[PDB]
Symmetry: D2
Subunit: 440 residues, 4 copies
Amino acid sequence: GEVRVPAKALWRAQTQRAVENFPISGRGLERTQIRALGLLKGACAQVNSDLGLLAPEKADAIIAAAAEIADGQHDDQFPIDVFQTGSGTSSNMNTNEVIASIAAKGGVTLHPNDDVNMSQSSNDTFPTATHIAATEAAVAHLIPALQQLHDALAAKALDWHTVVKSGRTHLMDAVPVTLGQEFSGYARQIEAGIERVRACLPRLGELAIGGTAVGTGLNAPDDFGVRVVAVLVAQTGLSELRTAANSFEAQAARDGLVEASGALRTIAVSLTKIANDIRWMGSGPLTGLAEIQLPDLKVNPVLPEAVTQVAAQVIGNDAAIAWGGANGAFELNVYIPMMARNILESFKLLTNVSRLFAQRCIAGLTANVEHLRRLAESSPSIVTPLNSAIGYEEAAAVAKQALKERKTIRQTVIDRGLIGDRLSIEDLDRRLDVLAMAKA
Amino acid sequence: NYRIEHEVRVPAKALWRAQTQRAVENFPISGRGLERTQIRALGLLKGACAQVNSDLGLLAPEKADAIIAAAAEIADGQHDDQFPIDVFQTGSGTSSNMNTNEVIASIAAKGGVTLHPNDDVNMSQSSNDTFPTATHIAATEAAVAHLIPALQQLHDALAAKALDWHTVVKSGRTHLMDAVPVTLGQEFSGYARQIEAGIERVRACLPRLGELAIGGTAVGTGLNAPDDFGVRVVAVLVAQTGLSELRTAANSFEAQAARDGLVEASGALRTIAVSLTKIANDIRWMGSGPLTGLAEIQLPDLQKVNPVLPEAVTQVAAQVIGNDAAIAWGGANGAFELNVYIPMMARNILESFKLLTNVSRLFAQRCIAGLTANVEHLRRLAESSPSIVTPLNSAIGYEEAAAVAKQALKERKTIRQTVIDRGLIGDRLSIEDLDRRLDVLAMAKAE
Amino acid sequence: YRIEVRVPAKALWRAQTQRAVENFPISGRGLERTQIRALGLLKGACAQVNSDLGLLAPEKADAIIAAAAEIADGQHDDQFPIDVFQTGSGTSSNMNTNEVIASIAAKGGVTLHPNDDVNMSQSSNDTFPTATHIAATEAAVAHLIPALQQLHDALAAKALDWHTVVKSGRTHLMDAVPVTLGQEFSGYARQIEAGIERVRACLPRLGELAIGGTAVGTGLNAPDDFGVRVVAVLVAQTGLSELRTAANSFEAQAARDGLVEASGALRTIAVSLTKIANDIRWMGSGPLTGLAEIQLPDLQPGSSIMPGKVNPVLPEAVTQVAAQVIGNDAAIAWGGANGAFELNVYIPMMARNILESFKLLTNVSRLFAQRCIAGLTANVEHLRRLAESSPSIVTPLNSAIGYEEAAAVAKQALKERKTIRQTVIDRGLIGDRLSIEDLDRRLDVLAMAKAE
Amino acid sequence: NYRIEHDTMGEVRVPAKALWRAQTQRAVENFPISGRGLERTQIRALGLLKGACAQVNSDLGLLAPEKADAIIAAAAEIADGQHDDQFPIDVFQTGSGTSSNMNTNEVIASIAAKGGVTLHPNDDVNMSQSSNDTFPTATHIAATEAAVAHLIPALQQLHDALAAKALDWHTVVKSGRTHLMDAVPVTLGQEFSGYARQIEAGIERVRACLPRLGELAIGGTAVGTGLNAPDDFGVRVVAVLVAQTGLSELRTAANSFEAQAARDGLVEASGALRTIAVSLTKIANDIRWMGSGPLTGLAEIQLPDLVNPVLPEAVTQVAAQVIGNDAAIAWGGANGAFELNVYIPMMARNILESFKLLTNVSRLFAQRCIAGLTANVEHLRRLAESSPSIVTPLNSAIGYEEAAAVAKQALKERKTIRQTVIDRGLIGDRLSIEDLDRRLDVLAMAKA
Ligand SMILES: COc1ccc(S(=O)(=O)N2CCCCCC2)cc1NC(=O)Cc1n[nH]c(=O)c2ccccc12
Ligand SMILES: COc1ccc(S(=O)(=O)N2CCCCCC2)cc1NC(=O)Cc1n[nH]c(=O)c2ccccc12
Ligand SMILES: [Cl-]
Ligand SMILES: [Cl-]
Ligand SMILES: [Cl-]
Ligand SMILES: [Cl-]
Ligand SMILES: [Cl-]
């Protein structure tokens, strides 16, 4: 039919039809997705050239246009809604048409399908770009952001190694701990988060390229996949990219995204705990716990709120990803654009809020040392450290009398006239010292 | 060009000011800000508040008119690009509240009127009762003015097909296996009811979705606001918008300590997403083929035909389900006098409303309306199914009925032709008695 | 062990049930008492109607009704061994009920055919979802709503008792202007009251029964009015007026959207309960290192290592129940979306989850009301002291001494740990623009909470 | 019919025959919520842990040898399943699992008393322990054992059944399906190789979570600090557990505070199970669709009758349950505070159920569905040979327009592409039979 296309638009007919067919969310591909589609087209053009299937002049043109796209020079040339044909074929064609128009600016005539989509199908390209984008997000961005947060938490764990305070279990007063020990716990949660992301990489980095329409590789060179992956690894430095173990699994399912989402969700769960504890420690200053002071951006914990909200989003996104993941049929899972949107957003949210959390909250925390000490000196104590001085039986009697008369262990020892040759006052304070009780 | 404020650097053509710019620098998290409906509702709210402060003599009429004019521009969508703050901001949404106050002041300034963002545009209000008020305004309007009419359009399209296909007999399917006859019209009457029930579900949540916190100020007590600020602002909002569903909260503390009304409404959207998944799935399966699939109907071409709108629908449904999980999560985790997950909740609920509205109209117009049934083929299959030999039992015994069914399937013939081919027509069974027993439309029991 | 297939001797079920037992050894958990009861109610009403329409012999119908009444009464809850994770229509549990009823009638000398007699006018597809919705409707009206009303009433009572118990508000977990403990609990009460409203609003669709639609929704091989007749009997016998024939017989079998809808209501209540329970254990936190606003009744020892430590175990039970309801809700929506054509085949899993959510919420709400809320005591003097020392209450001084001096009062009081009243005095601001009488009027914290 | 018992809170009436005591009975009355208690595997883990603890306490000279022996013997009876009816406490108990810990202590004491040995539930049976490190330890022992000894071998059985079908059906060519629409040829073998990979990847996912799932909190006592335990109590107890269970995946926690303030390892493991549920949903759905009919469906295969696809229905319902449980687990996981996460019994219920359901349904799926599948081989090939999707390799010979006409006529007349090309008289000018049979070899097209 007749198709009206904007003057300064590098996309063509089929992209414009897709724009008209899916006015649903008003939001299109992110920069990372666009970049990954550009990287893939350049790599495909390179391999088609190396195999003598594509004329060198045409290949050079594609590679040049693809490089512009991957460098972010055309992020306004991808107007198709996220909620499109579930294979992502519309965005694939979007990329083919934009490259064709760019090449035409350089006096080379490309056919979007026959040249720019050579050896590819409408079904193995978009999930490939999706996993490229997800792997890049995991390796180049999320993991270093998490490492930064870990290092900030670990720094406080060391700095506060002897800042004694009261433990809390069930929200109730418990035996002493140090602020440093608590932050050593938070740091380990983030460290384990990094371990979780790393563990999913062998399957997250699997690319479907080469499988063409249904996974068989019909109408592609037998080694298209492995050659394209090699160019991608060389150009991105992403050694985690690899050919799929099974070309049918790689298109019929998107289980790699579901798996990876689970790692992000676990991280969201840890971050909720860490953020929650931190805003509670900062609460008050009169009606709260008043354990620490957060940097001001009466200070509201705005970054913990940002963190806990991001975590909520990752959990919602995770549910959406799994839902689409389960609902593939036969040779193709047709939930890819929705799954891509959600997994890449979860990566982006976690990355950016972890860095903000680290730099503008954690690094600048100040402990209220004297208040914390007074809290520790209000914790329950135990009789065990008195055994080698008064014996198991007298200790047991002290514990019973303390419980009965609702007095501290220390005062009960004094009231029972136990301060003598077997136990001086100094010896009592040493054995019951709250920092020693924390076993730091 | 960038103008300077105090020190913070603000874009020249930006109508926001220093507090918004600081929020921009503090939350570079998603790169996504408030949606159009939330911005519109913030405008609506600020205008109504100014009207009431003017009515109560608390704000100069010249200042009030400036806010009202500015706010109207915002509510009309003229300033959507003036709200740069990330969704993932302070959990009260105070940053976006100040964004609105600042943009209104800057709009007024161009008209020669000076407004203090806090002292004037935020008069009688707090950082805590305004943003969720705007959220519930935006959600109520999305439910009443957009989603319900969209759903009604879908219902009517499905109902129209159910009528057109009233006598289009086909094989029923249970457990995906062949079963006794139904009509395509009956199936589509079921789809229509699912959507109709969806509308009932949305309507049922409105008494609580429409509750507004405005007037409760910082903690719910209404301290530093007129005692009747809430009912006055709501009456102005209703008067201006026609949204009679908007109401003052039943309890002012519940309305700020929790966002339970959004959790409730999301559940209604989630159920609709569940209904749409079933409908969309059946339709793309019915259209599967053209050779190795079910080949019951043909879908209209768009991009044989891929079912691209059922894929759009089932992907939207997945998103609504994910959004629903995030909303419940934020909803459960308020503390004492304030739930601090509102911007995240607003984002997700308003998007869910939008996606369902837009994809339902698309589904109705560009998929449902142009569906075409393979009528003769559907009847042929129904008339050849082993599932329909049971009315033959009283005439020929279930053992011979079984032989008929097995031979019909093997030779790919109707049950009728098989009965005839096996020489069963006689005094035990006339051809007219056979056609009565095997009347597959009558078996469907269409009203 | 009798033989038919080896079947336990004291088993009232027969061969088809025993086959299902051997086919689905998956969870080791079978139907609940409420589902069993509902299957009993339905079979008895069906025989009643079949008899009335002259389709079933009176002696046979009487034997079904008598046997089905024993099942509904809970006398045979050990005769339903089939796993929850069975054929997705629930046909196996339907046959279970048919077989057990036939065996009961056999003890009385009457021979019933499980299919031809007990399952007359019914199919293996409209029975189990009918029983599920009967069970879910009963759980909503007879058990959950009264239990929520009991918790509502306990919260409302506390709100009344604590109407003048002033304290500092908390927003973002930071100090805020005064509220009363009573206002907060009126807020919790409203959340529970709204929860009841949410359950009530789903009942028009939760109560829809598929019975009469037979195999595919068409009503083939059943009387045309079978559905309305069975429902009439059920409503008369159970008093459950919310039970009704489905608006659309195809929707009622192709989907279980009413269950998804109802779970949404339950999920929302779980969300409310989470907020309420969290606030309450935080309010009782400490007693020396926490908020120490209230004291929860002691229910059991908390720690071996810490002998006097008593933990908020009911709020912990409530919040864990809430997590379960949210999990169950996701399972129900998952099952609900994935029907195909004429039948949703996730009914037993959806039934398990919705009925569990009803049960857990019902039971934990009553325990929460009786063993926690009713016995709460407020630390009134503690709460009032913090309120009277709060920087947040200096605002009403503005019109007398100016906001800059009020800010100074707040800073000094906060630093010298004094009340706002005493700090105003210690700065010598009581003169001819401000009496001690006017000061106490302006710093009346209860009046600042504006309690009605 | 009762006897009097007591704790630090006062006196409590207990059923006369019951092996539990006061604190258990308080919890019986405090939490009548679900009506369901700990599972066999949980009780076993608690028994194993208590025995190991008594062994270490005896080794370190902290507990009298005659007392340790009485504990170890009692704990063995519990771990073997002789006293499961003595664990009446609801899943929905105190969030630390305090009550079930005391349950185990009390029952061990009452058992030993029958042997003439007097044990204090707290002082002897709970020596060097607290609830806060024992109940999550038992929970992670149960989950680790469920992963290693049960789930992975069940998945390997399912993988092997799917891989056997992939081998058997290696040349069973059929029409591909994308968007539910006919596509270029594949084989049943290839589809099933895809299913096998999903389950193989599932095993990889479970194995990848084990370094953290296997972490045990034991030794951290009340708040993570180890107060009131020997400094090496944890490593010693873990060594005993590893020796007695053969589970090398059991290990001390990398950080003692993380191990009690959080249950992130359970959230992580649930993610793997959830992913498996997602894979199983795809496989089960495909298989019931392939078996659909016998007239109006796809009718690609026939499922064994045990014909409704009842095992795929059991599989997809189990999947839904696992996804549901997964949401409950993450919810509890996120909501710890300071030194302790208090959602452990609920998280344990859900993670352990998810392990159990996937284990049992995978073995059933493998044995009683996958193994007995039969393919309609000739019919599949005939459809593949008759599909408009395979006319494309004729384009260069007969042209686009004629290829479309061939496709349309073949469908309308229900004939193969090969026969339609012949019938339209295209052999001779356009191409030979040899060329036709080469271009339309659907098996070669499937690249198999
Ligand atoms: C999706 O399903 C189809 C797609 C296309 C065509 S066709 O009309 O194009 N066709 C019929 C002409 C004889 C050559 C086979 C191809 C037919 C069917 N369906 C059937 O053939 C049903 C059937 N009937 N009888 C049997 O014995 C049987 C045995 C195994 C599998 C299926 C069947
Ligand atoms: C599930 O799908 C089937 C089930 C059973 C049988 S059967 O083998 O039992 N059969 C074929 C013999 C002629 C009488 C129809 C019944 C066939 C099909 N499939 C087809 O007939 C495919 C088909 N082929 N060609 C067309 O032109 C057409 C037009 C509309 C719809 C479908 C088609
Ligand atoms: Cl443009
Ligand atoms: Cl701008
Ligand atoms: Cl029995
Ligand atoms: Cl039972
Ligand atoms: Cl009614």
